[PDB]
């Protein structure tokens, strides 16, 4: 990242794949590189000046694209369904999942892109139950991208704790419903629940979210713990570990 000769704009994407795949001269590589400022090799007035010139030059260019002939850059706002979800959880081969994980990890370097990358990966959370072990890569990517505290706090501020809690409760209810009816054996039972509870523990371990988000999560933890304890036949080691973690969260959050 420290070797590039141009600096990509924070909130826009200038590359346009749809025109590039059609051999459009305006969307070529040289044309793209010509649209980016070179990487440059201070008092309050100077920073104010940079702010105003940047803002109003951007507005002028927006005019010139709106009325004139210069093309308009795409806005950095990622869609919630693409090929990325299909590739990231494919059961055909594991190397494809690993390669896609590496690609998306590399796609998130400047924080503006990390926004959308983290948001899309968080949106993909409900796929843990469907593709239990096949998500082992994606989890390892997700837990890798939020290893810093402020990203965890940002994700908490967007309401992921209720999301993960709802997913945990829904799949616990599915476990109870399955246990009531049939007697089959599944060797991947409890993987999604174990992963989700580990994720919740990671989110809560930081002090600010633990202090702030205790009042809305005690009910979910308590109900999940009781329903897990009610299990008597469809019990695996992962379910015991999940019960232990849930009890630990219950004990921790009930102090003060």
């Amino acid at each position: 990242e420290a070797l590039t000769t141009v600096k990509p704009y924070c909130n826009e994407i200038h590359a346009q794949a749809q025109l590039w795949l059609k051999r459009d001269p305006k969307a070529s590589y040289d044309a793209w590189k010509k649209c980016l400022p070179i990487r440059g090799i201070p008092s309050k007035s100077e920073l104010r000046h940079l702010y105003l010139t940047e803002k109003y030059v951007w507005r002028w260019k927006q005019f010139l694209s709106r009325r004139g002939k210069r093309t308009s850059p795409l806005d950095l706002k990622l869609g919630h369904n693409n090929w990325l979800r299909q590739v990231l959880f494919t059961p055909a081969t594991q190397a494809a999942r690993q390669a896609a994980c590496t690609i998306v990890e590399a796609l998130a370097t400047i924080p503006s892109r990390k926004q959308q990358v983290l948001d899309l990966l968080t949106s993909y959370l409900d796929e843990l139950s469907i593709a239990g072990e096949c998500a082992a890569e994606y989890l390892a990517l997700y837990q890798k991208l939020i290893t810093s505290a402020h990203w965890k706090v940002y994700l908490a501020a967007r309401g992921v704790l209720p999301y993960v809690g709802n997913l945990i409760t829904k799949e616990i209810a599915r476990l109870l419903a399955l246990e009531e009816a049939t007697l089959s054996t599944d060797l991947q039972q409890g993987y999604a629940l174990k992963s989700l509870t580990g994720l919740l523990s990671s989110f809560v371990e930081v002090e600010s979210i633990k202090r702030h988000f205790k009042s809305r999560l005690v009910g979910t933890v308590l109900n999940g713990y009781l329903c897990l304890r009610k299990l008597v036949v469809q019990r695996t080691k992962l379910i015991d570990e999940t019960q232990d973690m849930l009890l630990e969260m219950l004990e921790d959050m009930t102090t003060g």
Binding site: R48, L52, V153, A157, I209
Partner: protein, 133 residues
């Protein structure tokens, strides 16, 4: 209701519980409520005020969803380096080179001439005001 959400975000980003945060996470706070700043935006905001507590945090939010005529005049003065009120292609070129971003002379002439209504090949304050509205 928006003061409540701003307090919610500030408290959630409050690290030590004292109602005060650090400025290295200053960007992430309004970066989380849905607005997207740039690095120059961040540096201008931190320089204007500055460790931030709730009151000046509210003052910062007070001037974001709003453009004020004072800002347009300040931009016009920054562009008009010689201060004569007429933005020449040379001054535009200087400001774009200070930005580090590069154009040809033909393109600069083109954007200048498409910003003129009086046909004189020279933009002024009234044209700037009608442009930025």
């Amino acid at each position: 209701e928006q003061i409540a959400e701003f307090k919610e975000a500030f408290s959630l980003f409050d690290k030590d519980g004292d109602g005060t945060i650090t400025t290295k996470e200053l960007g992430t706070v309004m970066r989380s409520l849905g607005q997207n700043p740039t690095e120059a935006e961040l540096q201008d905001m931190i320089n204007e005020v500055d460790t931030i507590d709730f009151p000046e945090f509210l003052t910062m939010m007070a001037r974001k969803m709003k453009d004020s005529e004072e800002e347009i005049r300040e931009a016009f003065r920054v562009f008009d380096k010689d201060g004569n009120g007429y933005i020449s292609a040379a001054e535009l070129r200087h400001v774009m080179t200070n930005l580090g971003e590069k154009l040809t002379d033909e393109e600069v002439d083109e954007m200048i001439r498409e910003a003129d209504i009086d046909g004189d090949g020279q933009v002024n304050y009234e044209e700037f005001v009608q442009m930025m509205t």
